[PDB]
Amino acid sequence: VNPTVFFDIAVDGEPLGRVSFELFADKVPKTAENFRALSTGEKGFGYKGSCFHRIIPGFMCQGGDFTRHNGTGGKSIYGEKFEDENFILKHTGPGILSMANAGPNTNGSQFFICTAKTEWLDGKHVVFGKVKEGMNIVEAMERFGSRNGKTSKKITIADCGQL
């Protein structure tokens, strides 16, 4: 069965709520395994404590830079970057979990949660999971965003792991 992971989201350190994700190990196994391991921290690094640094209402919540803490960094469990695995799945609407990148074959750890359909990213960003529970928490995170992505309070992954 596809694994499930959770993020406990915090606002300036205060609990906001929990978001859980189904990871599509059945169709995107290498990319799902990276996100799973980064969520548990089992390699000695990962998402816990990192920030959703770019939140743009109507589009997405982006996070995952645990190496530079400024939106430029992150790394995978396979090295600094890994190839685009496939583009089977598309950015079909709210809750889609997909890899951020800086061009072809630059997957690291940064990711985004769609808050709307973003079909123009199809074929350029690898979709590998979806929100299971907590879309209402994602909707709350979105309200902290702005046009250029800067958030009005600091939104962090206070805890995360595999369910």
Binding site: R54, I56, N70, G71, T72, W120, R147, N148, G149
Partner: protein, 170 residues
Amino acid sequence: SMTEYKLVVVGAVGVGKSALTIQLIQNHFVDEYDPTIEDSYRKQVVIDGETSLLDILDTAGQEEYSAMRDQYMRTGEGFLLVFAINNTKSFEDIHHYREQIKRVKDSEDVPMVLVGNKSDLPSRTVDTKQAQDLARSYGIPFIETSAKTRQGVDDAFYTLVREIRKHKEK
């Protein structure tokens, strides 16, 4: 006198668009890279004794989202075309930015300044002569700048204002 100008800073990712803008607006430089989505700034300046409000639109280096980027170009009155002197691709990219501006504004006479940034770095790949010749072939000014040392920062923006002023009053 009092006037106002909409200036737009364009160029490939990482060439120093934001660092140049923040040096003009806030008079400081940091090595830290904060990638731009979109930022807008307002500053009152005096150029050649004439007071002006500068509205600076600091764009992202990415060239997707043509609908938004076309609007940037329709609204802007003058454009800084920024490349980095140690990034040959960013210099090769310059003609695309100019072609887009001419296309969107349907004009061969749009105020623009070519900016060669990071002049402080000892890792040059683009010769000054190459950039001078390209700006000359465009009929626009060329200025080398460093956001780190502030060299040429005021001159780059003030030169673009002078190009706009000339265009408006001609």
